[PDB]
Amino acid sequence: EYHIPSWDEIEDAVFSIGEALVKSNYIPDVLIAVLTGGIIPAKLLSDLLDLKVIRYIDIKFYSKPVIRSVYTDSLEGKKVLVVDDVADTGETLEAVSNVITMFNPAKVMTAALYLKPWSKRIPDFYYKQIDKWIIFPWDKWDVVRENSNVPVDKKERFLNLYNQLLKIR
Amino acid sequence: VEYHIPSWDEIEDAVFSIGEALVKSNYIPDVLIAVLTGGIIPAKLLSDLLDLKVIRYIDIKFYRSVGKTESKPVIRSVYTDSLEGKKVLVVDDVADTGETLEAVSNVITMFNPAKVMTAALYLKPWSKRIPDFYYKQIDKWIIFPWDKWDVVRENSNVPVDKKERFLNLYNQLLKIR
Amino acid sequence: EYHIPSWDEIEDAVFSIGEALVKSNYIPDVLIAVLTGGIIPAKLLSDLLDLKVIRYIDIKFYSKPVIRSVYTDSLEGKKVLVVDDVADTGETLEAVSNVITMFNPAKVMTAALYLKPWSKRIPDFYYKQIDKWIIFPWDKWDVVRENSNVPVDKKERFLNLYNQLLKIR
Amino acid sequence: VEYHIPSWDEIEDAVFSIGEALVKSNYIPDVLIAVLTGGIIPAKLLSDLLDLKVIRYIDIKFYRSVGKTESKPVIRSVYTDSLEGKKVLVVDDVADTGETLEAVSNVITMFNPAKVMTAALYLKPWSKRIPDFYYKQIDKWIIFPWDKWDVVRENSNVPVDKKERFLNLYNQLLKIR
């Protein structure tokens, strides 16, 4: 019912996307990270392919995705890769690709670690398609807060810290 | 008469007309978004007039020269925090094609604001897209006070004040670039 | 008691600063405009000397000046000119020069249209020193709202608009 | 032993230690400011741990090579709205000289926040400036999981996993640049 990828798998996901890019002859000049789920994949992919330029976008998904801020300079004539962690509906990556296009880049391609089966728009690069609810390492405590019955490690150490946090407000 | 060269006095009345039209329509903006850099002077003046304290900016340019860019205005940067639930007014100086205000209105909508409305001082009759608020509809080449020297450098035959002083300064400037 | 510069004088102020720059052999690569008083001088100076690159800083003066946001990209190895409309205490220009320095530019110089007699830090470029309270064209209605007895033009047309504005909230 | 190569497991415990130290000190940040790009992974993980929803960023770099820049960290961009009255935590991955966290703390102070405090995962004993919160004090070269390939490209003799797979990818990469 749950897919809980290890860090070891996350690295494998980054490798696969990296290789796919090199074999497709698409070496990005600029990485656009989707805040905040794309933060960690973008950084890892940056280190792998030696991509020194990373920019960011603050977009949240509510009926439609909403941009809160755009953290980038001129992207004109550049090859851009948008990176998020999981494409569920696919609307987020589409919305980001839509706004980045307005920057007149050479090309915008999209990427995600995992894909959901019935997404409207499929990313250009991805590792695997999973039919389960995905618990990333960087949002595990977000899930435990909604349901502490999920099978994740170090849950006891969290709840002790969690309680003390609530004993303040 | 070929060029329309509006005085600073006309610019003020242009700003007043917009502000008055805003109050009549009961649309007091929570945020002013200035189009860089042609609309940053109308935005500032309108801000002072209606006591609008929040001003944000967008760096967008439109090269109409032929023609390595398939038309389309080009965004270089967007300078703003969240605009969700906010009433937004976009301000530029002239709607020639109405395509810049079109491009800005589209990206601001993605911020999910309560409402976006556009405004430009002048409008061309051939402008495909029309701003919500505008002062006057002109059919001639407009030389603004904040781009007159840009025009002078492009055409030295324009009848503008203090030109002789500029050219001297310009000559000293080219001698060291 | 009041100094109320015409637009004609403002242009003269921009000219003087422009010439001073050219004769000092300091042609700025980037203009940093101080929001929002430096907005209009920076634009005019940009048009005069053909300076295509303008960036901005949102700083407000309360006991000390406060930065709200900084709107600029990399300034490394560039000649920077900070532009504001009036230097009263001089603390604002100093604070902006202090933060811009952290961007490792080639050089930071400051400029203002008018200077006040007893400022702590004097700008590098300025038009005139005035001992009176200055009412700029772009903040005249800010002064009328604090005191509608000031001798400025079009005051009647404002107050009629002003009233209708108050008849809403 | 020459390099310290922390596992993802150690990184998590490093983040936990900070979070626990934050609660003990009764300092729950209103805003997390990540140092780009070394601290953007600790910031995200700490954010998830303590349910901190507001994250801002600063693009600052420190070239320690000799030596056309008189030392000093160099700010390239600051990505944040107003921080006035806010409790702020700055997050980087390692305090080697403590000069970056020093430079960031100085510019954030000018935003007049309620309070700024700093935090780094690791600390060097020769670090002139000490972070408020840190996990462990290391005296060796640290190879983080998010910069291991950067180190490999600089020194190919480092004992890191999946290196053979990287080098193949690297060879295909250099053949088309």
Side-chain angles (χ1 to χ4, degrees), chain C:
Chain C
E1 190 197 295
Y2 281 110
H3 184 43
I4 315 175
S6 64
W7 283 106
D8 184 72
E9 179 178 328
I10 299 299
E11 296 176 357
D12 282 23
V14 173
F15 263 101
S16 177
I17 293 166
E19 293 171 358
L21 290 164
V22 180
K23 304 179 318 183
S24 295
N25 292 278
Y26 190 76
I27 309 308
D29 299 322
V30 174
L31 292 188
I32 302 295
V34 177
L35 301 177
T36 61
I39 284 184
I40 301 195
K43 171 62 179 173
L44 295 182
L45 188 64
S46 159
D47 184 48
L48 185 68
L49 266 44
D50 195 23
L51 308 174
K52 296 179 181 60
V53 189
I54 311 177
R55 295 306 183 264
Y56 315 90
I57 181 179
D58 194 336
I59 182 172
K60 228 131 199 62
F61 199 56
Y62 296 139
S63 185
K64 62 181 184 65
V66 171
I67 303 182
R68 317 192 65 173
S69 56
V70 185
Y71 297 143
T72 184
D73 46 339
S74 181
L75 301 177
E76 192 166 26
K78 292 185 178 183
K79 288 174 291 187
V80 171
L81 185 66
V82 180
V83 174
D84 202 11
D85 55 343
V86 52
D88 201 319
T89 65
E91 302 180 13
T92 292
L93 288 182
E94 183 68 18
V96 176
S97 187
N98 284 345
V99 60
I100 291 301
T101 301
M102 310 183 74
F103 282 69
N104 192 32
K107 189 73 179 68
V108 193
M109 309 211 75
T110 54
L113 296 183
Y114 302 101
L115 176 59
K116 288 308 175 60
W118 297 85
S119 72
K120 284 152 188 144
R121 297 295 181 190
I122 301 175
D124 301 276
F125 303 91
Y126 63 96
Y127 175 52
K128 270 167 53 184
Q129 183 184 267
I130 311 296
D131 308 346
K132 308 175 179 184
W133 192 248
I134 305 173
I135 303 185
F136 297 99
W138 44 86
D139 74 335
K140 55 185 301 191
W141 308 123
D142 200 47
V143 186
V144 176
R145 280 188 294 262
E146 98 187 355
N147 180 21
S148 61
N149 270 309
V150 291
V152 304
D153 289 324
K154 307 181 178 186
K155 194 161 57 179
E156 179 183 2
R157 185 171 177 183
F158 165 79
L159 294 178
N160 186 19
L161 184 64
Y162 186 21
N163 275 14
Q164 280 171 52
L165 198 71
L166 303 180
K167 270 43 159 186
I168 300 167
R169 267 180 181 322

Side-chain angles (χ1 to χ4, degrees), chain B residues 31-100:
Chain B
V31 175
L32 285 187
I33 295 189
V35 180
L36 300 180
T37 60
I40 204 181
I41 292 190
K44 168 63 182 174
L45 291 172
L46 181 69
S47 164
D48 185 39
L49 181 64
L50 295 180
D51 198 20
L52 309 169
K53 336 178 179 49
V54 179
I55 306 178
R56 295 305 184 263
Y57 316 89
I58 180 174
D59 190 353
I60 184 174
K61 215 166 181 179
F62 191 15
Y63 291 83
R64 295 175 62 184
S65 288
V66 180
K68 81 230 179 177
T69 78
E70 329 99 308
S71 301
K72 306 123 152 193
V74 176
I75 302 181
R76 293 191 288 183
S77 195
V78 182
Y79 300 137
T80 182
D81 35 21
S82 174
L83 298 178
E84 195 165 21
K86 306 276 191 174
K87 292 171 295 180
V88 173
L89 182 63
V90 179
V91 183
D92 202 14
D93 50 349
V94 50
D96 202 334
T97 58
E99 221 49 49
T100 291

